[PDB]
Design a protein around this ligand. Sequence first.
Ligand SMILES: O=C1CC[C@@H](C(=O)O)N1
Ligand SMILES: O=C1CC[C@@H](C(=O)O)N1
Ligand SMILES: O=C1CC[C@@H](C(=O)O)N1
Ligand SMILES: O=C1CC[C@@H](C(=O)O)N1
Ligand code: NA
Ligand code: NA
Ligand code: NA
Ligand code: NA
Lengths: 213, 212, 213, 212
Amino acid sequence: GSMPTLLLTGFEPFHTHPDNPSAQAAQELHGLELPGGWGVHSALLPVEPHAAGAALTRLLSEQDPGAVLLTGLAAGRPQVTLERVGVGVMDFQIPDNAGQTYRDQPIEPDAPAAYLATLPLRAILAAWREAEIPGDISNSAGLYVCNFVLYHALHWLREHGRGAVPCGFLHVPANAAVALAVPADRPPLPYLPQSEITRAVRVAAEAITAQSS
Amino acid sequence: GSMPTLLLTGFEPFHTHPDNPSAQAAQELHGLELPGGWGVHSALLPVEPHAAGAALTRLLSEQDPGAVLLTGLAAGRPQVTLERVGVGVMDFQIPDNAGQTYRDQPIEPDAPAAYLATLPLRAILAAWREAEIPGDISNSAGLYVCNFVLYHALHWLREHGRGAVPCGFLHVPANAAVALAVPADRPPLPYLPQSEITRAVRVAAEAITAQS
Amino acid sequence: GSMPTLLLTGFEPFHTHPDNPSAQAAQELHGLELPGGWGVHSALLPVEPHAAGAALTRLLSEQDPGAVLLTGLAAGRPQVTLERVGVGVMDFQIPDNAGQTYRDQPIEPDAPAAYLATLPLRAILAAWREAEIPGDISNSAGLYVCNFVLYHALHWLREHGRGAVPCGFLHVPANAAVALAVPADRPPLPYLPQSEITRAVRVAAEAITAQSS
Amino acid sequence: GSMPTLLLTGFEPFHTHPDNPSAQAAQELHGLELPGGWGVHSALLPVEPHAAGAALTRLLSEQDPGAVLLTGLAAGRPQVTLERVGVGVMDFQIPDNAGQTYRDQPIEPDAPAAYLATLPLRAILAAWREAEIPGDISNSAGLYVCNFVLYHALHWLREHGRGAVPCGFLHVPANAAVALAVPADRPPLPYLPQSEITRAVRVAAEAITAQS
Ligand SMILES: O=C1CC[C@@H](C(=O)O)N1
Ligand SMILES: O=C1CC[C@@H](C(=O)O)N1
Ligand SMILES: O=C1CC[C@@H](C(=O)O)N1
Ligand SMILES: O=C1CC[C@@H](C(=O)O)N1
Ligand code: NA
Ligand code: NA
Ligand code: NA
Ligand code: NA
């Protein structure tokens, strides 16, 4: 679509969480103009793998993005993290938003066990540090719906001759709304104000598109 | 002075931390006018109990506060917390800023084993929640310098007939500067942006003076 | 009762836990003969403060022990711990076994805010280390029923002219039974086999009675 | 040899740890006779990927095992865990025993991003539970030397037409010796007595050969 597009996704609330900070960040950053003619196109995905995969395939096909930043909540993690690897297995510790679970389930017959993310991981960490944002690389995204869409996107891009499109996953901590809903019988969550989370996603987006030059 | 004063303290950096969010919050809020004629008076304490006690005694005497909010860093905690109890023992897991440690050391011979904080704990929790700030009561402040000054202030106030002056401790998480300095071989810290920490201290101060 | 008695207590199961390792250890060590003519007398307490206090008062009065070792479960702690202080407040994050809760409730009108434990803390830590048992001092026992009985016993002993009787609290990790019952949606617990927990309680008992000489 | 062999490996001490429970477990279980004519063959690998890979290749070739159980220390984890996946990257947060680190380094150019472990994971979990041993599957082995040898063995087996040989990784908690050496300024480690760790490794080995 003429100018380069960064596809930015977040997820809906799920489980006992009343809010999803990845949804809030995607909503706030939609349409952001970045240097070099780049623009952010945001979308929200459902927390259910069949529908999330179908929606993500449509976005990848219709938007033909120059880079892909998938985001989601990791309640309990203290700092933003970049996923190194998407694994081709579905194994759900809690049900998805259709009440569904999967046990040791391969995502795709006759496909790789995993895909490495193709984002410029160290450049993003450096941009975060320069912006005074603590963060790190994670080497497991879980085997729930965030991992599923990471594997799904990397596989689709490779199969469509677009393996050079940088693509990865950014997990964010709880925001205040998520932390406030935790029951009194449970341990408190690390959290970040939503404005810090959104800024972290923005800084990652800016670093990704700066590198594609 | 003639108007009611909330005494607000923070601590200097210590150990491997290059910044102390409690220092930053106290500095930002000094002079804040609160409803009912209350004003915040801030001070920065050293992380060493002899000098901290001497400085805090001078503040309690000279500033004559109507309420006392002592604050400090609790690196590793995810949310602001209010200390329920100050224990009369110094036992240091790391040295203080004079390089000193204490082992099982009573703070004052012949004094109580502990003092309960006299801040309106549930009112502060409720004010935090209304401001969308997660937080809770803590039942141990450690036995390092933050606990020391909590015990010291509660004891001084009671010994001077001022036990009715609400007094307590507010531990804050790491800010970004504290979290960014953690070595690569160590676990990452929960943290909050400084503006969130300062706002939590402000909301607590406002709840304390509203109750008084 | 002629020879010196160490009073050893544990607690019944509570909450979602099917077993209490402090009960198991107290049961196994009842009647143990220790050097110097000392013998262990064990009892189990209910997880409910009114009945636990009444039972503990009867034990302190009827057994007239030379030392008191109160034990209980701290599910989530990795290593045995010795409580430094019992605080005169009841504040329950979960109900007790009568379904009861207390909020910011003073244990006793016109009594101290707290009592320091009078066990030989460093001698116990050293005995544990010599026995290759990791452990440490804890500076909060919580404000649930274990803290309640620690405060209760120290207060009773002081009020009855028996403040010199060494008295304290030993919190133990989950055993295997406790860890196996954790739901799949919850984080795993640190645990120790029951034989390690019982041995830790035994080593503490031996150090306490050795010091009373 | 003529009878089926389960190859069991552990690692030497590394970093600040004076002992490695995986070494102790492998040493105790060497030669264990299991039902069906199976026997355990143990070996101790160095915590350095070049020498560990060379030693493991020699073991896979010379011992010709019917199953492979690689074990190692995961200091901080509370319960035994089975690794689901070995990732083709070396990225070291602490140096190895040669003082070396690797940053984002592919293990082998032109090889898969990962290999899934081929042990009967659910059967092992069920055997642990029947033996009253808490445990679970882990979805990251780290990117240090334990992950390296998991990837190395799965790749070697597949490249030699032996992908059907069940092969995986079992991380164990600290034992008492590891936990006792932690400095006073650091958080305490979950741990298990060595006899509990060794029993967990034994129960896993028995479940693996029962399935084969
Ligand atoms: O935001 C989300 C949606 C699913 C979940 C995950 O990490 O898989 N976090
Ligand atoms: O800010 C501070 C100074 C000392 C330390 C403590 O909690 O004791 N935190
Ligand atoms: O064993 C027990 C009974 C009550 C609980 C506690 O720590 O208070 N642990
Ligand atoms: O026992 C060991 C050797 C290396 C380390 C690891 O998990 O990679 N644990
Ligand atoms: Na005044
Ligand atoms: Na100590
Ligand atoms: Na053979
Ligand atoms: Na790294």
